[PDB]
Scaffold this active site. Structure first.
Site, PDB file in Angstrom:
ATOM      1  CG  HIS A  53     -44.648  14.939 -10.697  1.00  0.00           C
ATOM      2  ND1 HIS A  53     -44.639  15.040 -12.062  1.00  0.00           N
ATOM      3  CD2 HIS A  53     -45.691  15.680 -10.251  1.00  0.00           C
ATOM      4  CE1 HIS A  53     -45.631  15.819 -12.436  1.00  0.00           C
ATOM      5  NE2 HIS A  53     -46.310  16.197 -11.354  1.00  0.00           N
ATOM      6  CG  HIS A  81     -39.271  13.985  -2.829  1.00  0.00           C
ATOM      7  ND1 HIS A  81     -39.456  15.108  -2.078  1.00  0.00           N
ATOM      8  CD2 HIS A  81     -38.400  14.312  -3.795  1.00  0.00           C
ATOM      9  CE1 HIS A  81     -38.701  16.093  -2.569  1.00  0.00           C
ATOM     10  NE2 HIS A  81     -38.073  15.638  -3.650  1.00  0.00           N
ATOM     11  CG  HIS A  95     -35.475  13.591  -7.529  1.00  0.00           C
ATOM     12  ND1 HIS A  95     -36.379  14.277  -8.314  1.00  0.00           N
ATOM     13  CD2 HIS A  95     -35.468  14.175  -6.300  1.00  0.00           C
ATOM     14  CE1 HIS A  95     -36.859  15.299  -7.577  1.00  0.00           C
ATOM     15  NE2 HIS A  95     -36.331  15.255  -6.349  1.00  0.00           N
ATOM     16  CD  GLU A 123     -33.837  16.409  -8.797  1.00  0.00           C
ATOM     17  OE1 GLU A 123     -34.091  17.015  -7.769  1.00  0.00           O
ATOM     18  OE2 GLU A 123     -34.523  16.500  -9.853  1.00  0.00           O
ATOM     19  CG  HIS A 161     -34.377  15.951  -2.662  1.00  0.00           C
ATOM     20  ND1 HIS A 161     -34.782  16.334  -3.938  1.00  0.00           N
ATOM     21  CD2 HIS A 161     -33.040  15.887  -2.694  1.00  0.00           C
ATOM     22  CE1 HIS A 161     -33.725  16.479  -4.692  1.00  0.00           C
ATOM     23  NE2 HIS A 161     -32.604  16.213  -3.984  1.00  0.00           N
ATOM     24  CB  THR A 173     -35.102  19.962  -8.465  1.00  0.00           C
ATOM     25  OG1 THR A 173     -35.859  18.939  -7.821  1.00  0.00           O
ATOM     26  CG2 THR A 173     -33.941  20.401  -7.608  1.00  0.00           C
ATOM     27  CB  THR A 174     -40.576  19.549  -9.525  1.00  0.00           C
ATOM     28  OG1 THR A 174     -41.185  19.981  -8.328  1.00  0.00           O
ATOM     29  CG2 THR A 174     -39.852  18.245  -9.316  1.00  0.00           C
TER      30      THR A 174
HETATM   31  N1  EWF Z   1     -36.818  18.401  -5.291  1.00  0.00           N
HETATM   32  S1  EWF Z   1     -38.256  19.083  -5.186  1.00  0.00           S
HETATM   33  O1  EWF Z   1     -38.116  20.419  -5.703  1.00  0.00           O
HETATM   34  O2  EWF Z   1     -39.350  18.300  -5.639  1.00  0.00           O
HETATM   35  N2  EWF Z   1     -38.499  19.384  -3.683  1.00  0.00           N
HETATM   36  C1  EWF Z   1     -37.478  20.063  -2.831  1.00  0.00           C
HETATM   37  C2  EWF Z   1     -38.253  21.220  -2.199  1.00  0.00           C
HETATM   38  C3  EWF Z   1     -39.681  20.775  -2.313  1.00  0.00           C
HETATM   39  C4  EWF Z   1     -40.850  21.386  -1.880  1.00  0.00           C
HETATM   40  C5  EWF Z   1     -42.071  20.815  -2.202  1.00  0.00           C
HETATM   41  C6  EWF Z   1     -42.130  19.675  -2.959  1.00  0.00           C
HETATM   42  C7  EWF Z   1     -40.968  19.058  -3.397  1.00  0.00           C
HETATM   43  C8  EWF Z   1     -39.753  19.608  -3.063  1.00  0.00           C
HETATM   44 ZN    ZN Z   2     -36.644  16.487  -4.785  1.00  0.00          ZN
END
Ligand code: EWF
Ligand code: ZN
EC number: 4.2.1.1
Length: 258
Positions: free
Chosen positions: A62, A92, A94, A104, A117, A196-197
Site C-alpha cells: 500500500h 510513510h 501517500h 490525502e 505521515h 486513512t486506510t
Molecule cells: N494514513 S494511515 O491511516 O495509513 N496511517 C495513519 C495512522 C496509521 C496507523 C497504522 C498504519 C498506518 C497509519
Molecule cells: Zn498515511
C-alpha cells in the site's frame, strides 16, 4: 479480493468490509482555511526526534513504512492538542501519479503532490495495538509535499526504494534522522479523525502542518516506480495510494496560528 486503490477495491468499496468508513470522524478531510479557528489555548507542539532509532523500511503493498524502535521513549511527540506522550513508530507517504494529486488532506480543496505521515502512539495504552482501540490512541503528524527543490533529507529514503520494489520486501534502514523531513514552521491545523486506510479506526488526533516541504520531481518519480504487486506478478505501479476527503460532520478544525 483485498482492499486497495483500484476501481474494483478502492476507497468507494472499503465500507463493505469496514463499515466505519462512513463513520462520524473519518479522515482525511478538506481544511477550509477561512473556517478553521485559531485556538489560543493549544499548548506549544514538541517534536523530539534527537534519539530516534530507525530500523527497517518495508513495502507493505500500500505504501512503504520506515519503522522505528518504539520499545522505549526515544522519538516522541507532545504538546499542541495532545495530553501525554506519543511515541514515533513509523512514517510513510501517500502520493499521486501526477504532481497535481497525491495528498490525502486538502487545503481549500488544493491537493499536494504527496503527504508524509509520522505515526505516534499514546504511551498510556502500553502498546500500539491497544492504542488503536482508543479515541486518543494515535497522533499523526501530516506534512504536505510540493514539487520544486530537492529535500536533501529525503534522498536516503529515495535511494533504498529500488531494494523494496515489490510487496513484502524490506531492507535494513538504520540511522535515518526524520528531523530532515520537517519544514521550518510547526504551525498546524488539528482535528479528531481516523486511519486513512482499512481498518479506518477512529483513534487519531491529526496534526497537519501548514508549511509544505519541497521535494524534487526526480525524488517523487522514484516513489512512483514502486509496485503494489509482489515479485514476479504483473507490474502495477504504486501511485495514487491516497483516500479522498471525507465529510467533516460534527467536527471543528483548530489552527495553532493567527
Ligand atoms: N494514513 S494511515 O491511516 O495509513 N496511517 C495513519 C495512522 C496509521 C496507523 C497504522 C498504519 C498506518 C497509519
Ligand atoms: Zn498515511
Amino acid at each position: 479480493h483485498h482492499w486497495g486503490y483500484g476501481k474494483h477495491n478502492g476507497p468507494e468499496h472499503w465500507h463493505k468490509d469496514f463499515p466505519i468508513a462512513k463513520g462520524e470522524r473519518q479522515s482525511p478531510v478538506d481544511i477550509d482555511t477561512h473556517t478553521a479557528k485559531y485556538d489560543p489555548s493549544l499548548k506549544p507542539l514538541s517534536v523530539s526526534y534527537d534519539q530516534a532509532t530507525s530500523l527497517r523500511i518495508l513495502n507493505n503493498g500500500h505504501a512503504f513504512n520506515v519503522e522505528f524502535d518504539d520499545s522505549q521513549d526515544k522519538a516522541v511527540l507532545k504538546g499542541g492538542p495532545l495530553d501525554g506522550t506519543y511515541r514515533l513508530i513509523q512514517f510513510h507517504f501517500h502520493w499521486g501519479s501526477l504532481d497535481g494529486q497525491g495528498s490525502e488532506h486538502t487545503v481549500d480543496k488544493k491537493k499536494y503532490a504527496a503527504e508524509l505521515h509520522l505515526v505516534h502512539w499514546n504511551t498510556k495504552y502500553g502498546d500500539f495495538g491497544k492504542a488503536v482501540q482508543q479515541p486518543d490512541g494515535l497522533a499523526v503528524l501530516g506534512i504536505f509535499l510540493k514539487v520544486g527543490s530537492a529535500k536533501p533529507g529525503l534522498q536516503k529514503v529515495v535511494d533504498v526504494l529500488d531494494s523494496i520494489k515489490t510487496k513484502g520486501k524490506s531492507a535494513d534502514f538504520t540511522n535515518f534522522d526524520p528531523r530532515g523531513l520537517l519544514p521550518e514552521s510547526l504551525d498546524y491545523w488539528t482535528y479528531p479523525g481516523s486511519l486513512t486506510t482499512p481498518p479506518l479506526l477512529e483513534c487519531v488526533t491529526w496534526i497537519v502542518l501548514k508549511e509544505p516541504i519541497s521535494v524534487s520531481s526526480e525524488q517523487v518519480l522514484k516513489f512512483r516506480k514502486l509496485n503494489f504487486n509482489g515479485e514476479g506478478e504483473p507490474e502495477e505501479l504504486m501511485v495514487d495510494n491516497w483516500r479522498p476527503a471525507q465529510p467533516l460532520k460534527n467536527r471543528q478544525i483548530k489552527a495553532s496560528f493567527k
